Design an enzyme around this catalytic site. Structure first.
Site, PDB file in Angstrom:
ATOM      1  CB  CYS A  72      -0.949  -0.004   1.191  1.00 25.58           C
ATOM      2  SG  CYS A  72      -2.070   1.408   1.181  1.00 25.58           S
ATOM      3  CB  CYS A 122      -0.731   2.610   3.689  1.00 21.93           C
ATOM      4  SG  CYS A 122      -2.272   1.786   3.206  1.00 21.93           S
TER       5      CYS A 122
END
Length: 108
Positions: A32, A35
């Protein structure tokens, strides 16, 4: 990192459900990118709101079991657990300003 709890499915109950305060669980993954990009923001926030808010970063790759539970169909997910009570759930990245506002508004 900061006041960032690297939760696991196993710790989730005791840490989040029995949170002695407000715990912002960020659901992330090794892959991710976004993220990671928001991680500094989360760290800064975790410091800024220390004592009022606690932050956590749960890796769904390591903890798949926790994804279905909170319908983690997309990441970064930001679930704010006020003493285990999911107060609000945001999906996707956002500005530090938006995050601060959201947190303030939820903490009240």
């Amino acid at each position: 990192s900061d006041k960032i709890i690297h939760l696991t499915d196993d710790s989730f109950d005791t840490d989040v459900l029995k949170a002695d305060g407000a715990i912002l669980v960020d659901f992330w993954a090794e892959w991710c990118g976004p993220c990671k990009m928001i991680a500094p923001i989360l760290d800064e926030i975790a410091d800024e709101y220390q004592g009022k808010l606690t932050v956590a970063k749960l890796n769904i790759d390591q903890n798949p079991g926790t994804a279905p539970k909170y319908g983690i169909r997309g990441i970064p997910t930001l679930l704010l657990f006020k003493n285990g009570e999911v107060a609000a759930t945001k999906v996707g990245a956002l500005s530090k300003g938006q995050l601060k506002e959201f947190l303030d508004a939820n903490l009240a």
